[model samples]
Target: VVGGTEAQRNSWPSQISLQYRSGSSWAHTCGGTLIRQNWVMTAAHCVDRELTFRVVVGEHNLNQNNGTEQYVGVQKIVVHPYWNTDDVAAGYDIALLRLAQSVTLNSYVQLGVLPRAGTILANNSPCYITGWGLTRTNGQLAQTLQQAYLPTVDYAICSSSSYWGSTVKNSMVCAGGDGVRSGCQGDSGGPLHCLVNGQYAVHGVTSFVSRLGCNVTRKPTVFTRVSAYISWINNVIASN
Candidate 1:
């Protein structure tokens, strides 16, 4: 995030840190949302390396112990079959990871609620993007989680020539193109929590940002619209 504040503990209980083995230690690679006790929702590109990966729930800080973290190994990965690394603009970047064991829910760890199938937010709807990503473009990851107020950018405006244009699809959600606040490296696969009705729901899976830069004017952060794949998620969980 280019401009964000440290998130309060347990404020976003479903947020997760997806890490991969690096030598003898583990390194945070991406963010994920716990959709169930044994499953997490993330971007397919986050697991593209095909390396051993682990998930940390209730993790508020990446480099320190908060006494509320649960480390679990990934038992299985189910990436969208139609996901194409070369065609991110076409969407289908979502994935689900089954945990080796179910985790216990607590104030610091819980399940993320998904939006209703085919639901869409109004233009400029209030929302927030949370993650442990870099604070600046090409910067180091934050020690603690961070969040930025990123209002939704409806498809009409986001798909304009001055914005993402044709690259922006209805299957994706666009937010934060103010050139000061956006998701950067390490934020991919995280949640875009949007307040709908009277509750907050995970409406997006962090997918990509402007190739020109992390936080660029008219280049909002893009996400895989969760509502577009509610059935796919349900099918994966049920069949698995």
Candidate 2:
């Protein structure tokens, strides 16, 4: 994320690196939240391309090996049925990946708690966006995972013409717009953890940033509101 610092190795245990095979190595593409031992939540756009994908859990640095990392192949991918690639603003941007094997839970790897259905945070609620996305809008991805404090921007204000306007759908959550910190490219599908009742919950799946730049004023990061898709997620997991 732009204007952020390296996150503590254990700060966001549920965070994961979603990578695609490039040449003989795997390249980090986007971030994801481990919602189940074998299922991951990420943006549907992250898997738009047809390529070999794998997930790395308990990962910290992208350039160095951390003994805690567990690499696993994706066995199945289920993108939201209503998702339309041409129109991200229309809001169905979530996807779930079923892993070939369940990842073990440890100090550095765990499941991300999801927000309750229909739950909505008040304006400026405490939250953070974490990812391996770029440190800047046009920069390369960070070596280590980064996180930025991005307070919630309630729908009423985020949809104002001065901010994200109509592109900010009600099904999406807006955070940070202060022109200092924000999610950038490669940060898509990452988690937006909001503090509710003293516990952090994965309330958002990083969706999009402003086309103008990552840290532009009034262009807080947009995310697919997880609360809006609890039923969809549950049904997908149940029937699959």
Candidate 3:
């Protein structure tokens, strides 16, 4: 996250590190949300590469071991059928990964509550984007988790010519166009947790930042609006 602060350990318990096998070591590639004991929600692009992947729950520091971490192999992946790698701007950039084994829930590891179906936040609603993504454009991933207050930029405003315009689909959510705070590389697939009725819910799956830069003015971070896929998520989870 650009212009973010280190997130408190227990502030976002559902956060997970999605890693790919890198030679003899595993390297964090993207951030994900633990939607179930054995299921994770992330951006489809995060798993586009054909590499062995694993999910780490309770991870805080990416450079060191966290005793509370639980590692599990990704057994299955289901990307949105309409997702097109070359057409991310068309939306449908979400995916679900089934774990080889179910992880235990603890204070540091828990499921992310999803938003109600079709729920949409009002303009400038309070939300935070959390991830291990870069703190700046072209920067390396953060050593610890970081979060930025990315207020929602409603569709009417975000779709204006000055912002995302035609690329900003209704299926997506835009946030933090202030040019200072935003999601950057390695943050894709993380959660955009919004406070609703005093409870936090995973309302978005981090999708893309501006091609111009990570924190470009009028180019707020875009996300796959989770509420729009509630039925799809439920169907996959139920029949799988």
Candidate 4:
């Protein structure tokens, strides 16, 4: 609500909060896009191998302290067996999560589609990114659903002629303008919803930072292209 209009707020779909328990205390692991009754897609890097987590779905008031909540624990964290953050050529940053309980499929919490390859999202195309992440680089989490719109930059212009050395890797896509629009700190592993077929279809998961602040438009914010990983995702959830 901090960056969007009231109408935008009403139209925005809800997001999932994946939380883990550690020594009687609960901590958020990452944000996920609810894809089905038993699945969600998120970044593999957000998995904390040492903890047990759950998904809280269909909630708009992310900060609701009234104790009215829905919880589903982590059954297993399937970090892509071949994921290698250090490898520049093969960026395996995406993952599928299996929940102990099934998520209720409603309009607010629904499955999303990926954009086809060669599709270009132009600047200020009204893309929305949401998370429990810090508002600013050092700002505390807003608790309530916090969202920002990042315009897709021209891929060639974004990575051309000696910039941040970023590339439109086969598994990734670039967005944002000359360091002015971006996913800020703590926004990682969240969904970037793109409107498709009259509903929002998720196209990106907040993956990396280009510059410093959310204000920076240069060095495009990269994401795990949802379409590229559909097979892996379907396979993971097909059985359940």
Candidate 5:
């Protein structure tokens, strides 16, 4: 696939960490990706076994309470019907989050466009993955919005034993980690965007990974490829 220049950088997409207490005051959990006015795409693992979530979007500085942020409650979060992490073979990690109110679209507020199927998005396609996830491996998750650029790898190479092995699935595509750059915690539900027609297409959604670090060679970051799930997404939109 083609790559974008630095000038089209910020146009990629933005993401914020959705932090909430599991029980007490401990603010440690997962991340979320903002989509349309009332929809978000996140990992089922992040919202698995939970009925409610407090979403925070448009906040660049997660450390500060001030910014153009919107706090919305999750009205409905539908995980893939096939999702079953207990059985690793069913890699249904993708999910759709329906917010109580749709987010108003703006220059920075955008959704992903589907990347063409079978298009080989080269090893350095200049794609980006952003989040407020963990900065250091085994370190506490970060509370500030962070962004990183990852190179897209061909699926065949990504599935190699020297790489992701059996972890990379059909519903998943990857970016980051050519033994150099990579994605970690908190990048979940965010996007791996490909620019097309001057618009950022949502090619993938952060799903799962084998390791946690800013630098991990061969461990491909799994993402939900939008192309394969376009019909499912459209059905969700139509039903709503």
Candidate 6:
């Protein structure tokens, strides 16, 4: 994220690294949230490449060894049926990845809590976006995970002409249009943890940002509203 600080280890235990094989090594491409022992929630666009993907849980750093890391192969990928690659602005940008094996839960690896179905945050609700994405626009990925406080921009304000306009929908969450702290490239599919009722829940799946820049004025980070898909997620998990 742009203008973010390094995240403490296990601070966001549900945060995971979604990587793709590059040459002989794996490269971090996006972030995801562990919703179950074998299920991960992320953006559909993140896995659109159809490349071999893997998940790294309990990972705080990308370059150095992190004893808490748990690497696992993706056994299945189920993109939202209504997702349209050319129509990200139309919403339905979410997806799920089933891990080849169940990951053991620990202090550094755990499932993310989800907001109740149809829950919506009030304007300016406190939230944080966490990931190992680029620290700046078009920059290299960070060595360690980063997080930034990105207050929620309610649908009404975010959908206004001066903000995201029609691009922001009720099915999406908008946060941090302050032109300072924001989610950048490689942050897609990460979690937008919003505090409510004295607890934090995974309220969003990082989806997009302004094409102009990662941290542009009036261009808050857009995310797939997690609460809007609670039923869909449960259905997928039950049927698959």
| True-vs-predicted CA distance for residue 108, candidate 5, Å | 4.2
lDDT (Cα, tens digit) per residue for candidate 3, span 149-219: 99999999999999988999999999999989999999999999999999999999999998889999999
TM-score of each: 0.99, 0.99, 0.99, 0.82, 0.83, 0.99
CA RMSD, predictions in order: 0.6, 0.5, 0.5, 3.2, 4.3, 0.6
- Candidate 6 per-residue lDDT, tens place, 47-97, comes to 999699999999998999989999999999999999999999999999999
Off by over 4 Å in 5: 1-16, 21-28, 116-123, 196-198, 211-214
Sliding window of 10 residues with minimal summed lDDT for model 6: 132-141
Which of candidates 5 and 6 reaches a greater TM-score? 6
Model 4 poorest ten-residue lDDT run? 1-10
Error of 6 at 195 (Å): 0.6
For candidate 1, lDDT tens digit of each residue in 115-223?
A: 9999999999989999989899989899999999999999999999999999999999999899999999999999999999989999999999977889999999999
**Model 2 whole-model lDDT (C-alpha atoms):** 0.96
Per-candidate Cα lDDT values, in order, are 0.95, 0.96, 0.96, 0.64, 0.64, 0.96
After the best TM-score superposition of candidate 3, give how far the Cα of residue 27 lies from its true spot, in angstroms. 0.8
TM-score, predicted candidate 5 vs. hidden true structure: 0.83
Given candidate 4, what's the lDDT at residue 168? 57
RMSD of 5: 4.3
- Which residue pairs collide in model 2, if any? none
Query: Model 2, 160-192: lDDT tens per residue?
Result: 999988999989999999999999999999999
